[PDB]
Write an enzyme that holds these catalytic residues in place. Structure first.
Site, PDB file in Angstrom:
ATOM      1  N   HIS A 191      61.637 -47.558  96.657  1.00  0.00           N
ATOM      2  CA  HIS A 191      61.181 -46.864  97.856  1.00  0.00           C
ATOM      3  C   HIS A 191      59.655 -46.964  97.885  1.00  0.00           C
ATOM      4  O   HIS A 191      59.065 -47.318  98.908  1.00  0.00           O
ATOM      5  CB  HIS A 191      61.604 -45.398  97.806  1.00  0.00           C
ATOM      6  CG  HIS A 191      63.040 -45.166  98.158  1.00  0.00           C
ATOM      7  ND1 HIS A 191      63.626 -45.715  99.279  1.00  0.00           N
ATOM      8  CD2 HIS A 191      63.990 -44.399  97.576  1.00  0.00           C
ATOM      9  CE1 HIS A 191      64.874 -45.293  99.372  1.00  0.00           C
ATOM     10  NE2 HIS A 191      65.119 -44.494  98.351  1.00  0.00           N
TER      11      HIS A 191
ATOM     12  N   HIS B  84      66.761 -47.816 102.556  1.00  0.00           N
ATOM     13  CA  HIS B  84      68.125 -47.954 102.071  1.00  0.00           C
ATOM     14  C   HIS B  84      68.840 -49.147 102.702  1.00  0.00           C
ATOM     15  O   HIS B  84      68.635 -49.462 103.872  1.00  0.00           O
ATOM     16  CB  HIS B  84      68.900 -46.663 102.336  1.00  0.00           C
ATOM     17  CG  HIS B  84      68.537 -45.549 101.405  1.00  0.00           C
ATOM     18  ND1 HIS B  84      68.394 -44.244 101.823  1.00  0.00           N
ATOM     19  CD2 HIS B  84      68.312 -45.543 100.070  1.00  0.00           C
ATOM     20  CE1 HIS B  84      68.097 -43.482 100.786  1.00  0.00           C
ATOM     21  NE2 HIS B  84      68.041 -44.246  99.710  1.00  0.00           N
TER      22      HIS B  84
ATOM     23  N   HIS C 138      65.289 -47.915  91.690  1.00  0.00           N
ATOM     24  CA  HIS C 138      65.541 -47.489  93.065  1.00  0.00           C
ATOM     25  C   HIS C 138      64.398 -46.658  93.653  1.00  0.00           C
ATOM     26  O   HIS C 138      63.954 -46.918  94.768  1.00  0.00           O
ATOM     27  CB  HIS C 138      66.852 -46.691  93.105  1.00  0.00           C
ATOM     28  CG  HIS C 138      67.272 -46.270  94.480  1.00  0.00           C
ATOM     29  ND1 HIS C 138      68.342 -46.834  95.135  1.00  0.00           N
ATOM     30  CD2 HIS C 138      66.794 -45.306  95.303  1.00  0.00           C
ATOM     31  CE1 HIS C 138      68.512 -46.235  96.299  1.00  0.00           C
ATOM     32  NE2 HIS C 138      67.585 -45.303  96.425  1.00  0.00           N
ATOM     33  N   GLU C 139      63.924 -45.656  92.909  1.00  0.00           N
ATOM     34  CA  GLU C 139      62.829 -44.811  93.392  1.00  0.00           C
ATOM     35  C   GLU C 139      61.535 -45.619  93.525  1.00  0.00           C
ATOM     36  O   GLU C 139      60.800 -45.476  94.499  1.00  0.00           O
ATOM     37  CB  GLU C 139      62.600 -43.611  92.455  1.00  0.00           C
ATOM     38  CG  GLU C 139      63.756 -42.596  92.377  1.00  0.00           C
ATOM     39  CD  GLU C 139      64.309 -42.197  93.743  1.00  0.00           C
ATOM     40  OE1 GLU C 139      63.528 -42.163  94.716  1.00  0.00           O
ATOM     41  OE2 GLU C 139      65.523 -41.907  93.842  1.00  0.00           O
TER      42      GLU C 139
HETATM   43 ZN   LIG Z   1      67.026 -43.922  97.981  1.00  0.00          ZN
END
Ligand SMILES: [Zn+2]
Ligand SMILES: CC#CCOc1ccc(S(=O)(=O)N[C@H](Cc2c[nH]c3ccc(C)cc23)C(=O)O)cc1
EC number: 3.4.24.86
Length: 254
Positions: free
Chosen positions: A189, A195, A185-186
């Site tokens: 980004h 999101h 997830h990180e």
């Molecule tokens: Zn996030």
């Protein structure tokens, strides 16, 4: 070709002691294995749902900070024994912590596609990580690829191609499968993903549809089929970033 984002992976003294058992071997193998599992998700993702695949991550350098950083009075370091601002919590304000890491790791970060910090801190409100969002624009500092950003307060050039992951939440160690998703997830980004819109059901399915995708704003359990996959929303954003930035800083897989 140039389809790999090389990483600088850093484990602080907390991660060393609590996740690695005070063993360099153990800490090192854990990170190596986690990145490889995260790499499987990235490498097997077809960003254009067709042939634009095989893009992933690989550790360029691993740094294990066995003990805290001897600091002086009014100065702060991301690997310092105590937390800032509230040491009593032994968990920094995640945002200040990511900025501090970026400041202190600038020199090395300028040499890699991405720099990631692994720690063991129970951040407020179930927060497990943080990372700057990437972009296809060359002069946009955040995310993949180093681009010097002069920090007015820092009084120096830093790089926002960073992110961090913590494997502690609510007083305990999170699951291995959950750890993999925090980092996915990180890094997500970093790779340009925002999101998943909690509106467009196409990118935020109900549990009976396979559950949420990895970029949902509320941490997924990892129990459901879609939890370790990128949504269409994420694929489109990341595809856009990769398309231009891969030529910028991606290398060949070793
Ligand atoms: Zn996030
Ligand atoms: C397990 C799993 C799935 O992945 C995760 C899902 C949620 C988290 S979190 O709740 O800790 N939230 C962080 C930080 C953040 C808050 N508002 C933000 C607004 C913009 C940006 C770019 C980051 C943040 C995140 O979303 O990265 C961490 C991991």
């Amino acid at each position: 070709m140039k389809n790999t984002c090389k990483l600088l992976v850093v484990a602080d003294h907390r991660f060393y002691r609590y996740m690695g058992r005070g063993e360099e071997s153990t800490t090192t193998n854990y990170l190596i294995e986690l990145i490889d599992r995260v790499d499987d998700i990235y490498r097997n993702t077809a960003w254009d749902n067709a042939g634009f695949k095989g893009y992933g991550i690989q550790i360029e350098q691993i740094r294990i900070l066995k003990s805290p950083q001897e600091v002086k009075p009014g100065e702060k370091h991301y690997n310092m024994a105590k937390s800032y601002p509230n040491e009593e919590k032994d968990a920094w304000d995640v945002k200040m912590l990511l900025e501090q890491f970026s400041f202190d790791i600038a020199e090395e970060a300028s040499k890699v596609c991405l720099a990631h910090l692994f720690t063991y801190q129970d951040f407020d409100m179930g927060t497990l990580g943080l990372a700057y969002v990437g972009s296809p624009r060359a002069n946009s500092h955040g995310g993949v690829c180093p681009k010097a950003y002069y920090s007015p307060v820092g009084k120096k050039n830093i790089y926002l191609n960073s992110g961090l992951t913590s494997t502690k939440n609510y007083g305990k160690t999170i699951l291995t499968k959950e750890a993999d998703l925090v980092t996915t997830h990180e890094l997500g980004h970093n790779f340009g993903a925002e999101h998943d819109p909690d509106g467009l059901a196409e990118c935020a399915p109900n549990e009976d549809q396979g559950g949420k995708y990895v970029m949902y704003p509320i941490a997924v359990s990892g129990d459901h089929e879609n939890n370790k996959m990128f949504s269409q929303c994420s694929k489109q954003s990341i595809y856009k970033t990769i398309e231009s930035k891969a030529q910028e800083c991606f290398q060949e897989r070793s």
